[PDB]
Amino acid sequence: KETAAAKFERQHMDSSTSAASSSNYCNQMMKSRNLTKDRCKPVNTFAHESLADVQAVCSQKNVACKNGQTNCYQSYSTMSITDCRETGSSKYPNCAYKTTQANKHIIVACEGNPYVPVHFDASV
Ligand SMILES: [Cl-]
Ligand SMILES: [Cl-]
Ligand SMILES: [Cl-]
Ligand SMILES: [Cl-]
């Protein structure tokens, strides 16, 4: 079974590029990160910062999660991220995604030792 730390890294990390280069970024990344295997994952967000910078968020501004938990952390500075969401024509096994790139603060839930991000809550 995939660990909660590695699951976040597979779903929400993309340090290779600075930003989403094209509209086909999500269609390629959702397939490459195995998020369209048996079901097209409706909403997923990739971060375009180094692994150390996203892991550093857990020791930053402590905020409440959307569900009610107190282990979420908002980043101090705005980070380059891309939100991938299914379009109207998206239907398995032909998953289609909308690519939207913007610079925002990231909010991530952190747990364990070392204290690393496991869930991507939202972006502000
Ligand atoms: Cl791990
Ligand atoms: Cl997400
Ligand atoms: Cl680590
Ligand atoms: Cl998540």
Side-chain angles (χ1 to χ4, degrees):
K1 198 180 181 291
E2 192 179 37
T3 56
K7 194 181 179 290
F8 176 85
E9 289 172 342
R10 185 177 57 89
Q11 291 184 325
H12 308 288
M13 291 303 300
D14 190 26
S15 306
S16 59
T17 181
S18 59
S21 60
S22 60
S23 59
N24 296 125
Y25 167 85
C26 288
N27 289 329
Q28 290 162 203
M29 283 297 291
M30 294 296 287
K31 195 180 180 180
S32 299
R33 297 299 180 97
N34 303 321
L35 296 167
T36 55
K37 276 278 185 179
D38 298 310
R39 185 207 69 180
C40 323
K41 195 178 184 289
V43 179
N44 193 67
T45 312
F46 292 96
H48 302 277
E49 302 294 320
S50 60
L51 189 68
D53 285 15
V54 181
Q55 283 171 334
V57 182
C58 299
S59 60
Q60 296 183 31
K61 190 75 180 180
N62 187 227
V63 286
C65 305
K66 285 183 79 180
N67 63 351
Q69 289 190 238
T70 56
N71 68 325
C72 283
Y73 291 91
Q74 189 170 325
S75 59
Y76 292 144
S77 59
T78 52
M79 294 186 180
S80 183
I81 58 161
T82 306
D83 192 55
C84 302
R85 294 201 170 211
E86 277 185 284
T87 53
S89 60
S90 186
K91 190 183 178 181
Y92 186 84
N94 308 310
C95 319
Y97 290 94
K98 184 188 171 70
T99 305
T100 324
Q101 168 72 56
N103 302 100
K104 334 153 200 165
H105 305 94
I106 58 154
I107 304 161
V108 288
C110 308
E111 69 180 37
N113 186 36
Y115 208 59
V116 287
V118 291
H119 295 107
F120 196 92
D121 199 46
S123 59
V124 174

